Amino acid sequence: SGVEGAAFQSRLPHDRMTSQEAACFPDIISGPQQTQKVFLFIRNRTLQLWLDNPKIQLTFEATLQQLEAPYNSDTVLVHRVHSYLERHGLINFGIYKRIKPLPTKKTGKVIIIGSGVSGLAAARQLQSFGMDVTLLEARDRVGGRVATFRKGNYVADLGAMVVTGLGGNPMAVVSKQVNMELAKIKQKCPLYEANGQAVPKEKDEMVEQEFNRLLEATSYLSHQLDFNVLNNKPVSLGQALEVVIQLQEKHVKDEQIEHWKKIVKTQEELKELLNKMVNLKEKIKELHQQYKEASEVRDITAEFLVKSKHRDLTALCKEYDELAETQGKLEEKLQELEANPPSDVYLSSRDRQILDWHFANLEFANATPLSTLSLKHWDQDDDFEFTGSHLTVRNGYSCVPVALAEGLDIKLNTAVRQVRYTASGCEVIAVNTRSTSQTFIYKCDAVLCTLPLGVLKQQPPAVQFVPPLPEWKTSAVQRMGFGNLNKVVLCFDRVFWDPSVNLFGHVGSTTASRGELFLFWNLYKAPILLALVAGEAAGIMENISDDVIVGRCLAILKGIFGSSAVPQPKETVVSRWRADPWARGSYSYVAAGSSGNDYDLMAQPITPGPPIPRLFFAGEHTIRNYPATVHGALLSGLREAGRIADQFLGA
Ligand SMILES: Cc1cc2nc3c(=O)[nH]c(=O)nc-3n(C[C@H](O)[C@H](O)[C@H](O)COP(=O)(O)OP(=O)(O)OC[C@H]3O[C@@H](n4cnc5c(N)ncnc54)[C@H](O)[C@@H]3O)c2cc1C
Ligand SMILES: O=CCCc1ccc(-c2cc(F)ccc2C(F)(F)F)cc1
Numbered sequence: 001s002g003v004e005g006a007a008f009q010s011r012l013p014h015d016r017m018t019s020q021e022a023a024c025f026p027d028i029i030s031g032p033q034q035t036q037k038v039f040l041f042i043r044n045r046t047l048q049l050w051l052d053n054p055k056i057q058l059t060f061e062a063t064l065q066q067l068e069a070p071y072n073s074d075t076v077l078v079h080r081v082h083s084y085l086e087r088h089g090l091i092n093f094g095i096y097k098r099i100k101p102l103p104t105k106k107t108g109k110v111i112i113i114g115s116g117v118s119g120l121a122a123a124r125q126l127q128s129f130g131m132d133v134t135l136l137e138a139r140d141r142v143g144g145r146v147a148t149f150r151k152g153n154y155v156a157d158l159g160a161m162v163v164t165g166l167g168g169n170p171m172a173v174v175s176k177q178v179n180m181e182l183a184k185i186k187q188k189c190p191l192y193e194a195n196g197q198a199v200p201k202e203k204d205e206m207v208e209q210e211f212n213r214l215l216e217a218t219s220y221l222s223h224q225l226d227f228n229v230l231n232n233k234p235v236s237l238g239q240a241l242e243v244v245i246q247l248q249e250k251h252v253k254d255e256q257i258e259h260w261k262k263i264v265k266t267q268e269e270l271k272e273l274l275n276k277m278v279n280l281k282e283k284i285k286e287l288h289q290q291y292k293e294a295s296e297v298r299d300i301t302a303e304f305l306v307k308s309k310h311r312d313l314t315a316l317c318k319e320y321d322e323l324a325e326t327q328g329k330l331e332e333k334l335q336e337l338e339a340n341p342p343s344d345v346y347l348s349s350r351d352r353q354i355l356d357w358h359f360a361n362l363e364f365a366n367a368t369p370l371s372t373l374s375l376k377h378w379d380q381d382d383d384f385e386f387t388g389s390h391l392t393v394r395n396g397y398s399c400v401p402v403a404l405a406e407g408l409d410i411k412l413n414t415a416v417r418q419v420r421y422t423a424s425g426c427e428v429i430a431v432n433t434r435s436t437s438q439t440f441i442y443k444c445d446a447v448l449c450t451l452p453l454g455v456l457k458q459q460p461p462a463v464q465f466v467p468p469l470p471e472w473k474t475s476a477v478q479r480m481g482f483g484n485l486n487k488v489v490l491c492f493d494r495v496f497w498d499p500s501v502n503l504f505g506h507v508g509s510t511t512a513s514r515g516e517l518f519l520f521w522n523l524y525k526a527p528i529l530l531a532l533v534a535g536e537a538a539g540i541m542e543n544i545s546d547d548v549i550v551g552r553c554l555a556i557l558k559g560i561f562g563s564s565a566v567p568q569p570k571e572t573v574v575s576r577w578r579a580d581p582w583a584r585g586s587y588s589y590v591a592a593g594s595s596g597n598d599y600d601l602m603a604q605p606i607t608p609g610p611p612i613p614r615l616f617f618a619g620e621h622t623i624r625n626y627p628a629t630v631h632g633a634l635l636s637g638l639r640e641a642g643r644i645a646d647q648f649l650g651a
Pocket of ligand 2: 159160161162164364365366381384385386390628629
C-alpha cells in the first residue's frame with residue numbers, strides 16, 4: 001500500500017512501534033493507543049514523503065506542510081518524529097540536494113578510519129549533522145571493497161557487483177540518488193561439465209533438488225535435534241552435509257541388500273521347485289512304463305489295471321501341471337525383480353560433481369569453505385532478506401562510493417597505524433603510503449573505525465590501539481569468520497557466449513577444487529566475462545600468476561564454446577582480496593563457534609577507563625541482521641552516525 005509500503009521499504013512494521021522507537025518515545029508507548037496510531041501514521045507518512053523523492057532534503061517544515069489534517073496541528077510530535085527519523089538515517093541519507101544549507105559552525109571533531117561505503121555513509125550523516133569530519137583512507141581511491149575496473153568502454157567490478165532484492169533495501173534509494181543502472185539477473189544458469197558437455201536440464205533439476213533436501217536435513221538436525229557440538233567442537237555445515245550424504249548412501253545400500261535377498265530367496269524356491277518336478281517326471285516316466293506293459297497284453301483284471309494306471313497317470317500330470325504354473329508365478333516374479341532393481345548408488349560420480357557445484361555456489365555466497373561455517377548460525381540473518389530479484393550494477397558499483405564522497409574531506413594514501421583514546425579525547429596516527437617517513441597526528445573527540453575484520457584480525461596488528469581493545473572485543477574478532485572470494489575479468493573484442501544468459505557454470509572435477517572458476521558472469525556493455533574463484537580455491541589461486549589463471553579460464557571456455565571460438569583477451573584483471581593488505585579477505589561469515597551475537601559485540605563502542613564512549617565501530621562485520629553486504633555496510637554507517645551524534649550533539 002501507500003504509507004504501509006513506506007514502512008516496509010524502511011524495514012519497519014507499519015502497525016507497531018519498534019523497540020528502538022519505544023526507547024525514544026516512552027511517553028508514546030506508555031500513553032493511549034490512539035496516540036500510538038497517530039505516531040505510526042506520522043512516521044509512515046514522513047517516510048513516504050522522503051522515499052517518493054529521495055533526491056531532495058525533506059525538512060521538518062516541508063513535512064509539516066504536506067501532512068493532512070489533523071496531523072499538521074501536532075507540530076511538536078511531527079518534529080519529534082522527523083528529528084528521530086533524520087538522526088537515525090531513515091530519511092535524508094545518501095546523496096540529495098540540501099534545502100537548508102549546512103551551518104558554518106561545526107560541533108565536535110570525528111576521525112573516520114576507512115573510506116568504504118560504511119565510512120562514507122557515516123561521514124555524510126555526521127557532516128549533515130553539522131560535525132567536523134575527516135576520513136583517512138589508506139588506498140588511492142574510495143570505495144574499499146566496492147572496486148570497479150574502468151578502461152575505455154570496459155567496466156567490471158572486482159568487489160561487490162550484486163544488489164539483492166529492492167524491497168526493504170536502502171540501496172534502492174541510493175540507486176535513485178546516483179542514477180545507477182541495475183539489471184535483474186536472468187535465472188537460466190546452464191552448467192557444463194569439465195569436458196564441456198552441457199548438463200541435461202532434467203539432471204540439473206534432480207541434483208538441485210537433492211542439494212535443497214540435504215540443506216533442509218542439516219537444518220532439522222541442528223534446530224530440532226540439537227546436533228551442534230561434535231566431541232566438544234562446534235559442528236560445521238560442511239561436516240553436517242557430509243554426514244547426511246553418508247546416511248543417504250547407507251540407506252541406498254541397505255535397500256540394495258534387501259532387494260538381493262528377495263532375489264536369492266526367489267531363486268532358491270525356483271530351484272527346489274525344479275527339483276520337485278524332476279522327481280515327479282521320473283515318477284511319471286516310471287509309471288508310464290507300467291501303462292505300456294499293461295497295454296501290451298484281455299480279461300477283466302488286466303483291463304481294470306489299465307483303467308487304474310490311466311487314472312493315476314493323468315492325476316500325476318495334474319500334479320505336474322500344477323507345479324508348472326507355480327513355476328511361472330515364480331519366474332515372472334524373478335523377472336520382475338531383476339528388472340526393477342532399486343538405486344545402485346545415491347550419487348554417481350558425475351552426480352556428485354554437479355552436487356559439488358551447488359556447494360561451490362554456497363561457498364561463494366558465504367565467501368568460505370562449508371567446513372568453516374556454523375551449522376546452527378550460518379544463515380542466522382535469513383529472516384531479514386529483501387524481497388525481489390537480485391540485480392547487478394550494469395555501469396559499475398563504484399558509482400555509489402564515488403558519489404557518496406562528494407564534498408567530504410578525504411585523505412587518501414593515508415594508512416592509520418595507531419589509535420589512542422582517553423577519557424579526554426583521541427589521537428589517530430597515520431603514515432603516508434608514498435613517503436613512509438611522513439607521519440600525521442589527527443586529534444579528535446571520537447574515532448569511527450571501519451577497518452575490515454580481516455585488518456582487525458591481522459597478526460602482527462596493522463593498527464595498534466592504545467589502550468588495547470578489551471578482551472570481549474578481541475575475542476569476538478578472533479571468533480568471527482572472515483572469508484575470501486576472487487574474480488577473473490576477461491575483456492574480449494567480440495561476444496562468443498550466449499548474450500541472453502547472464503550466468504553459466506563450470507562443474508569442477510574434484511570436491512577439493514569445486515570452487516575453481518565455477519561460475520561465469522555476463523553483465524556488461526562491453527565483451528567482458530567474470531569468473532569466480534570460491535571456497536578453498538579462492539585463497540590458493542592467489543598464488544598463481546594472472547597469466548596461468550587466465551589460461552585456465554580460456555581452457556574452460558574453449559571446452560564449452562570451441563577452440564576456434566575463444567580469442568585471446570585484450571585485457572585481464574585478477575583480484576587477490578586475501579593478499580590485499582587493506583582488506584585481507586572479502587567479507588565476514590558466521591564461523592563455527594561464533595554466532596550473530598559476535599556481530600553485536602563488534603558494533604559496541606569502547607569507553608575509556610576511569611566516562612563517555614570515544615571509539616566506535618561500523619563496517620559489514622558490525623551489523624548482525626545484514627552482514628557481509630554493501631547495504632549492511634551502509635546501514636552500519638547510518639547507525640554509528642546516529643549513535644555518535646546522540647553522544648556529542650544530544651537527542
Ligand atoms: C570480491 C567481493 C565480492 C563481493 N560481493 C558481494 C556483492 O556482490 N554484493 C554485496 O552487497 N556485497 C558483496 N561483497 C561485500 C561488500 O563489498 C562489503 O560488505 C562492503 O563493501 C564492505 O564495506 P565496509 O565499509 O564495511 O568496508 P571496506 O569497503 O573494506 O572499507 C574499509 C576501508 O578501510 C580502508 N583501510 C584499511 N586499512 C586501513 C588503514 N590502516 N588505514 C586507513 N584505512 C584503511 C580500506 O582501504 C577500505 O576503503 C563483496 C566483496 C568482495 C570483496
Ligand atoms: O559478489 C560478491 C557477493 C557478495 C554478496 C554477499 C551476500 C549476498 C546475499 C545476501 C543476502 F542477505 C541473501 C542472499 C545473498 C546471496 F544469495 F546473494 F548471496 C549477496 C552478495
